Design a protein around this ligand. Structure first.
Ligand code: E64
Ligand code: E64
Ligand code: CA
Lengths: 215, 215
């Protein structure tokens, strides 16, 4: 795998979204991974619908939380997921209104990265594209991040509470990192992104719950 | 639905097991629901293997915890689950050693009970058979239960931490309850069972994470 890769430079990443108060991080993380694979397989970059997931992934709990693997399993069983334009995000749970006419992507399954293995996560990001991951984003330092490579020894790798998207990895001034796309709007962090310490003992649990959809 | 049903009286429930220190409650709960459906569809009552689930349901975390829906999805995708005799429980994680020769049951999917709806749970238990459920089993009062219908206002329906099996429901001396099969051995509770308050505002979260396998 290359020493660094940034899928934003390949046009695999859509604009940063804002999930609002709804606990739908899992939906944005899942949509992000699917958007990356969609670009890789079709050549087109499109916004997919997290609301479609929020309202229809019955295995999850809508704004009450959920898992990315569950989301991928839904898309596979449902035979598709709508584009954002065909099923707009409103930040609240509603009845499932999936319309196949607005289908913009399909999923043939998913794969998980070996728990805690950052080397495997690196290889998966290099070979596949953006990967859905989960971290502990409860620290004040995380929420007020603005630049540099984030590391706080207080992060608890066993307290995963927020799903995000690893769109790449690299090194900044000698500090290896993961390029993370968040869903808290373009004004949070560095234009919606945060560089998180890589190879620093699985900081914040970055490699504890990673997965990607098959397409 | 009848005013009461006890599947143990129909021979749909296997002996009470002991999960040990391993956090495999989800595996025993899932196996319990599958054993019930297996009896209903074949007429034979057999012990299914929670170890098969612990070692092979990659979507879960073995002794670190997991979900029943994930377990059912595995059995469906794997095209089967081994009997206990063909894949013995040891209470620790090992590599997946599933052997189709020992297949004792199949799964065609799963269904979830509407969140928090005890009426729906009652109807599901009556029409389907034993149903996998999750509760807050952290209270000292729960752990030292011995008889009667269990109710502790301190139970938190939002703090689900232990999966069990609803093998029936009824009423004891005017107190409506759920007949719950635990996995803490035959010496815990009442021969491994506990009667939990039913229709008392979803006590302990009994109807918050219920599901059953399709067969
Ligand atoms: C994340 C966010 O919006 O900031 C959101 O709370 C979320 O989905 N959190 C997840 C945790 C990460 C994926 C680690 C969560 O809490 N998941 C558990 C959901 C409850 C389990 N039950 C069901 N139905 N799956
Ligand atoms: C229950 C027990 O053994 O007493 C055991 O801890 C367990 O599986 N608990 C579940 C909770 C109930 C089903 C509500 C649990 O903690 N599940 C979450 C597992 C972590 C999520 N990640 C994966 N890989 N599914
Ligand atoms: Ca699942």
């Amino acid at each position: 795998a290359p020493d660094s890769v940034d899928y934003r430079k390949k046009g695999y990443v859509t604009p940063v979204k804002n999930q609002g108060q709804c606990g739908s991080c899992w939906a944005f993380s899942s949509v992000g991974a699917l958007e990356g694979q969609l670009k890789k397989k079709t050549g087109k970059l499109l916004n997919l619908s997290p609301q479609n997931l929020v309202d229809c992934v019955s295995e999850n709990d809508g704004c009450g939380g959920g898992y990315m693997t569950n989301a991928f399993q839904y898309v596979q069983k449902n035979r598709g997921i709508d584009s954002e334009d065909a099923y707009p995000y409103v930040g609240q749970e509603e009845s499932c209104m999936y319309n196949p006419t607005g289908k913009a992507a399909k999923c043939r399954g998913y794969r998980e990265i070996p728990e805690g293995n950052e080397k495997a996560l690196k290889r998966a990001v290099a070979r596949v594209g953006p990967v859905s991951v989960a971290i502990d984003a409860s620290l004040t330092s995380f929420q007020f991040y603005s630049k540099g490579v984030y590391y706080d020894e207080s992060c608890n790798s066993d307290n995963l509470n927020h799903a995000v998207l690893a769109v790449g990895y690299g090194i900044q001034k000698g500090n290896k990192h993961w390029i993370i796309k968040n869903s808290w709007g373009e004004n949070w962090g560095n234009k919606g992104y945060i560089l998180m310490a890589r190879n620093k003992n699985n900081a914040c649990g970055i490699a504890n719950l990673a997965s990607f959809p098959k397409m």
